[PDB]
Amino acid sequence: AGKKVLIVYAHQEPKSFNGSLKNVAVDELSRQGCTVTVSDLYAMNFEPRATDKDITGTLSNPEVFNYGVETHEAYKQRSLASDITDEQKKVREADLVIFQFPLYWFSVPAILKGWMDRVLCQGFAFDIPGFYDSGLLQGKLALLSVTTGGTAEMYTKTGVNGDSRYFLWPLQHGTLHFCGFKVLAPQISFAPEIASEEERKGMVAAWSQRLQTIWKEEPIPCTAHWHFGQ
Amino acid sequence: AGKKVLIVYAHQEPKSFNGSLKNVAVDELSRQGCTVTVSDLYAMNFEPRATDKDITGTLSNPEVFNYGVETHEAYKQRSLASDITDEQKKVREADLVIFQFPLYWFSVPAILKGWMDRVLCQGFAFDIPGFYDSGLLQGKLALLSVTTGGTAEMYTKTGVNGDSRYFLWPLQHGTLHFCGFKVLAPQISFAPEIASEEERKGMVAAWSQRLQTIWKEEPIPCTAHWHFGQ
Ligand SMILES: Cc1cc2nc3c(=O)[nH]c(=O)nc-3n(C[C@H](O)[C@H](O)[C@H](O)COP(=O)(O)OP(=O)(O)OC[C@H]3O[C@@H](n4cnc5c(N)ncnc54)[C@H](O)[C@@H]3O)c2cc1C
Ligand SMILES: Cc1cc2nc3c(=O)[nH]c(=O)nc-3n(C[C@H](O)[C@H](O)[C@H](O)COP(=O)(O)OP(=O)(O)OC[C@H]3O[C@@H](n4cnc5c(N)ncnc54)[C@H](O)[C@@H]3O)c2cc1C
Ligand SMILES: C=Nc1c(Cl)c(N)c2c3c(cc(C(N)=O)nc13)C(=O)N2C
Ligand SMILES: C=Nc1c(Cl)c(N)c2c3c(cc(C(N)=O)nc13)C(=O)N2C
Ligand SMILES: [Zn+2]
Ligand SMILES: [Zn+2]
């Protein structure tokens, strides 16, 4: 209160552990009196491919298709596909953007990758001045709530997978910071499938409890040192 | 020769710089007598979303959908969608897989993220146990050939983007090495948009030239120390 939150959710199954983390976020933020919107990307059959269909009307150069240039011009001329502009409205209005997803290949599922590719366009999220602290989404907060197959011990600097912070870099720094977001500390729910039930309840409840005081958090220093240093 | 190469290519425009790097690879590897296949993902309209359409038979659990579980079972039973098995045959036969793509948000374009998510399934590319140095694609080589908006100076340890090798981690380590590939050093062609005609022609030629001796190369040590230092 008065704050708006967008949850960008990427799981196919409403009964999943990610579906439960998304639902308790809706439940707890709704309870606080926040304005909440969820983009359920699989239920929306969200298009992930960056293609010339993302521009309506006639292309800026139909000889040689340059996705970046075309979408930048289309944004300035109010000529983006409506699925993209609908997401952009939700982002524009949000004070916090939560991403809820299972880790796929040390990153987001392709459907969520395609949201970041197509929704966060030049002119909207950043300019070619435009970027990192000069990024156009400055003022806004973002938070990654990720679930994994591998265990917390696997995600240590000398475990098989490396530190979890190592995989966060392209998402927190190259994506969210580049657009100007301030980044809250990630919520990482390790290996729910091997946890009990229980520890799974622990995990869901810890996320609900964290969201009680989410507005009181300061963002992380989204630097190479935070991700890789000591 | 004496070798089969699959190039997984992700760019919308045949006249692009990525297009030229993909064609020079086909030209040089063809000239050497190698067998060469190209998966041009935007031309194939390749499906990036991981959904229940990727399984055609009876689901293991039809009331709660688990993508990993159902694709692993479908692989074993031969009930995966045929686009996924078509790609797996190309990978099965390849000695070397080159990914040619523009960097999107410090990672691969979503259409290529979807290829990784859907093609490299459990049972085909890894099993649990059977990952990293015991991954199922052991004995194959992989190479990321990436282009960027950002300059080489931006992609240094003290530059705004961080060192280039930091964004390579989820791809080379979390994906390729997890599946048992040995990873050749990446080809990064920085900032072709800003380079002159001569400097772009130079970058194309440096890749053709590198490919002349590609079979003599050793892989990188795909470790946290190679990516992050210390
Ligand atoms: C393409 C692909 C790539 C992947 N790449 C990686 C990777 O790089 N690194 C990695 O570590 N892992 C990877 N994984 C594994 C993936 O990250 C995990 O499978 C996923 O994070 C598990 O979350 P989920 O919501 O699907 O769990 P679910 O299987 O849905 O949940 C686990 C259990 O929790 C239960 N549950 C649901 N709600 C509740 C609740 N409210 N309270 C208590 N229990 C509950 C469920 O019923 C279920 O029994 C990959 C998976 C795929 C398919
Ligand atoms: C969604 C999105 C996300 C991005 N995220 C990032 C990111 O995180 N970090 C980043 O650094 N960049 C990012 N970029 C920028 C992107 O990586 C670059 O635009 C892309 O790498 C440039 O390659 P290209 O093949 O498209 O260049 P092109 O625009 O096709 O090439 C530049 C020039 O080369 C010319 N050319 C083609 N072939 C030849 C040849 N044989 N000889 C000489 N000239 C030739 C072309 O005609 C053109 O003038 C992003 C872009 C998009 C659209
Ligand atoms: C990396 N790919 C993975 C895929 Cl594709 C997958 N289906 C899976 C995992 C797990 C752990 C790790 C991991 N890296 O710890 N990685 C993966 C896991 O439990 N499952 C079920
Ligand atoms: C990060 N996203 C980017 C987008 Cl989406 C994009 N369209 C673009 C860049 C460039 C550089 C960098 C960068 N990080 O150096 N990042 C990006 C660039 O020249 N173009 C055209
Ligand atoms: Zn940062
Ligand atoms: Zn590795």
Side-chain angles (χ1 to χ4, degrees):
Chain A
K3 298 282 167 191
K4 296 195 173 73
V5 180
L6 168 65
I7 297 167
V8 182
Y9 167 69
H11 202 287
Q12 301 96 343
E13 174 56 63
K15 299 176 209 171
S16 70
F17 191 80
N18 270 267
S20 293
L21 288 177
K22 172 268 295 184
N23 292 331
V24 300
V26 173
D27 283 349
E28 170 51 27
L29 297 170
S30 187
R31 185 201 73 76
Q32 287 178 35
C34 303
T35 297
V36 186
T37 307
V38 179
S39 288
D40 183 339
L41 298 191
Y42 291 100
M44 298 164 72
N45 199 212
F46 188 78
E47 170 64 69
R49 307 172 189 92
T51 75
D52 70 355
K53 299 186 200 307
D54 290 357
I55 300 89
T56 67
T58 68
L59 299 163
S60 163
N61 186 331
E63 304 302 66
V64 179
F65 181 62
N66 181 309
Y67 185 80
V69 170
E70 291 275 4
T71 61
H72 178 205
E73 291 308 319
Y75 177 79
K76 291 187 304 179
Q77 298 305 311
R78 282 148 285 108
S79 203
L80 290 159
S82 67
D83 62 340
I84 290 171
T85 56
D86 285 350
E87 295 307 297
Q88 291 177 340
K89 181 184 198 189
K90 307 167 185 177
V91 172
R92 185 174 294 112
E93 294 174 336
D95 297 289
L96 167 60
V97 182
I98 298 166
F99 299 86
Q100 179 69 61
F101 54 100
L103 197 65
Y104 277 19
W105 291 119
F106 284 33
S107 183
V108 294
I111 194 168
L112 175 54
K113 186 57 160 56
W115 188 95
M116 306 169 143
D117 300 341
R118 293 175 69 242
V119 174
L120 305 173
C121 73
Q122 192 167 347
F124 173 67
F126 66 86
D127 261 318
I128 241 293
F131 59 88
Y132 292 113
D133 283 359
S134 292
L136 302 176
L137 304 182
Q138 58 193 283
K140 295 187 184 316
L141 301 165
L143 189 168
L144 303 177
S145 175
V146 192
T147 63
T148 63
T151 66
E153 44 98 30
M154 287 166 213
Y155 283 102
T156 61
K157 318 138 317 129
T158 61
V160 296
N161 295 328
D163 202 314
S164 52
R165 289 187 187 186
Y166 294 164
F167 71 73
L168 286 168
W169 174 257
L171 300 166
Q172 292 191 333
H173 183 79
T175 310
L176 297 179
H177 184 186
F178 183 94
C179 299
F181 283 99
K182 281 166 196 174
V183 177
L184 309 175
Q187 189 71 190
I188 304 163
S189 304
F190 290 101
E193 226 223 74
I194 75 133
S196 159
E197 205 260 287
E198 263 281 75
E199 313 159 334
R200 283 176 223 152
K201 307 289 254 311
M203 302 188 98
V204 177
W207 177 228
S208 191
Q209 295 170 339
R210 175 178 179 189
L211 290 161
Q212 299 178 216
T213 52
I214 195 72
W215 305 109
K216 289 285 194 301
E217 295 190 13
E218 311 148 33
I220 67 168
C222 182
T223 62
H225 185 250
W226 185 93
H227 291 80
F228 305 117
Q230 162 82 299
Chain B
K3 302 279 183 172
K4 288 177 186 31
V5 180
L6 169 68
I7 298 174
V8 183
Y9 164 73
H11 199 293
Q12 305 93 343
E13 170 54 59
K15 295 199 168 89
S16 62
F17 191 73
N18 271 263
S20 294
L21 293 172
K22 179 267 290 175
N23 290 337
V24 303
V26 172
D27 295 342
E28 173 45 34
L29 297 158
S30 183
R31 181 199 70 75
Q32 283 174 36
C34 306
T35 296
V36 180
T37 306
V38 178
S39 285
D40 180 341
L41 301 188
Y42 284 102
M44 293 165 71
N45 196 40
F46 189 80
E47 170 66 62
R49 299 173 196 85
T51 74
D52 67 4
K53 300 299 107 251
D54 297 344
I55 302 93
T56 76
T58 305
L59 302 164
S60 176
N61 184 339
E63 286 142 310
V64 181
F65 182 68
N66 178 320
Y67 185 81
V69 165
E70 300 288 354
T71 54
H72 178 198
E73 178 68 14
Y75 178 73
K76 291 184 292 179
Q77 296 287 341
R78 300 188 183 129
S79 64
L80 286 168
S82 69
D83 64 330
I84 288 177
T85 55
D86 285 353
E87 295 306 296
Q88 290 177 344
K89 178 180 180 171
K90 297 167 199 182
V91 173
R92 184 180 287 118
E93 299 188 337
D95 296 300
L96 166 66
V97 182
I98 296 172
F99 297 85
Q100 174 63 61
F101 60 99
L103 197 70
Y104 274 18
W105 291 120
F106 278 28
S107 179
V108 285
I111 196 172
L112 171 59
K113 181 61 161 50
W115 184 104
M116 300 166 154
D117 295 346
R118 296 172 71 242
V119 175
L120 301 175
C121 76
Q122 196 168 345
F124 174 64
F126 65 95
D127 205 345
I128 306 267
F131 54 87
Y132 289 123
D133 290 341
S134 297
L136 301 179
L137 300 181
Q138 55 193 103
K140 304 188 179 298
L141 295 168
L143 187 158
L144 301 173
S145 174
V146 184
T147 64
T148 72
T151 59
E153 260 297 300
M154 289 163 78
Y155 284 111
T156 55
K157 176 174 80 91
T158 58
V160 292
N161 292 330
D163 197 56
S164 55
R165 293 185 174 188
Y166 301 166
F167 70 73
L168 299 170
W169 176 254
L171 299 170
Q172 286 189 338
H173 185 74
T175 312
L176 296 173
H177 186 180
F178 185 92
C179 299
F181 290 100
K182 282 161 317 312
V183 178
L184 294 180
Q187 188 66 191
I188 313 185
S189 305
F190 294 97
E193 302 174 285
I194 92 107
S196 64
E197 180 73 29
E198 324 92 83
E199 286 172 329
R200 300 196 280 260
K201 279 186 186 152
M203 283 194 289
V204 177
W207 178 223
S208 189
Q209 239 233 328
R210 173 178 179 195
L211 279 173
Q212 296 173 22
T213 53
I214 193 81
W215 302 113
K216 307 164 91 171
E217 294 190 12
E218 293 291 348
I220 65 163
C222 181
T223 66
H225 175 265
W226 185 91
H227 288 81
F228 305 116
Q230 209 50 192

